Amino acid sequence: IVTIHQEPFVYVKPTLSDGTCKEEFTVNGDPVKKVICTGPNDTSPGSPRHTVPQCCYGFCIDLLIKLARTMNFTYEVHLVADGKFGTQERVNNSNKKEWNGMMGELLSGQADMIVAPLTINNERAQYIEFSKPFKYQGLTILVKKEIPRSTLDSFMQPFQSTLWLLVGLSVHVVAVMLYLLDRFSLTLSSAMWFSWGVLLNSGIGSFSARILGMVWAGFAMIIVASYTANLAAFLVLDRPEERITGINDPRLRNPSDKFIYATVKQSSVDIYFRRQVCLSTMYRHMEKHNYESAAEAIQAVRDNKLHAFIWDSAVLEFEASQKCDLVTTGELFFRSGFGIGMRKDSPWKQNVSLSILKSHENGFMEDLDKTWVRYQECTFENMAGVFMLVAGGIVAGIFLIFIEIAYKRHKDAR
């Protein structure tokens, strides 16, 4: 058996000094089965490849153990050196159609049965027969979400300054005209104290002044009403940045340097993209950025190197569940199941299909899904910086008025 290292399905960890792995337990205190794993020590090329014994465990190991219990099997697991599913490639003497990776290893006779996440495809089925899928999951889009904290901090004039200057000019002219009217018939600062008390409610304070007071009281509230209306509108209208709304996203239909997204290597998604009637620019946009593994791809996505990634929906959902910093958008498309890679002359077709269907109908699949894929689930500046600035300004004004009154009292009473 050859198995591909898949993080949500096949966990691979180094063995201990004795050559075995630890006996861990789940939340229910059950012994987790582990099988000795054989594979290369380093996946990257140009390295001292050593076939050290690993210890791979996960989702498919339970199904493999169930199959070995139902029918007599002596299975040994293996890891593909290149870490790829395997499709048709081109080499020297390009007039050759040969399969590489896991599919090529299976065709070469090295392996007889494959228990690994492999998407069923027409090209793969034209040469290797598959069995009934374990579960039906399509492919989706994975994009790292941002955390909106603040925008347009309101300290003294976040919107405009000419409006504030006009308001200041208006209050100054209304104050001086009120003083002139009072003098013609509040000579001291009592008039301006009353005006400021009317502007800002603090409980401090013939017919000529009545109309001025009435119009000033009416005019005072519209400014704050407009300010709070604008604040509410700007809080309601946020960034709402959406990366991908679906397969038919017009933004995805065009290549952009700002948003880079691609798959890892050749797979069923690659064949689906190849067999497109009018989606041609996708290959030119994606062939310039390729990786070697899904772990590296998701690490790059986390490190903001990439913006979106395409893979099986179940893998993305599990990654989002285990890491709340990532979210999955879009909808299911090109939905297809999994399969088992077996040679056409293998007499184990029915003997495996019946067991798979029995396990599916007896609730083993849902139990494994619950116990392996559903472990767990999931202003900074605007109201802080402006508050700090206001507090500093208030402290400065308090000190200034303190020294001002200290000098003024001495000057008045010398």
């Binding site: 919107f159 405009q160 006009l166 000529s208 109309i211 001025l212 119009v215 009416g218 005019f219």
Partner: peptide
């Protein structure tokens, strides 16, 4: 925004008229 100038200027005429009325009376 732009309408704020119109709004503030709308009441200025009424305030000036009231001031003239109370000055002449």
């Amino acid at each position: 925004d732009i309408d704020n100038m119109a709004g503030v200027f709308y009441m200025l005429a009424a305030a000036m008229a009231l001031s003239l009325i109370t000055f002449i009376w």
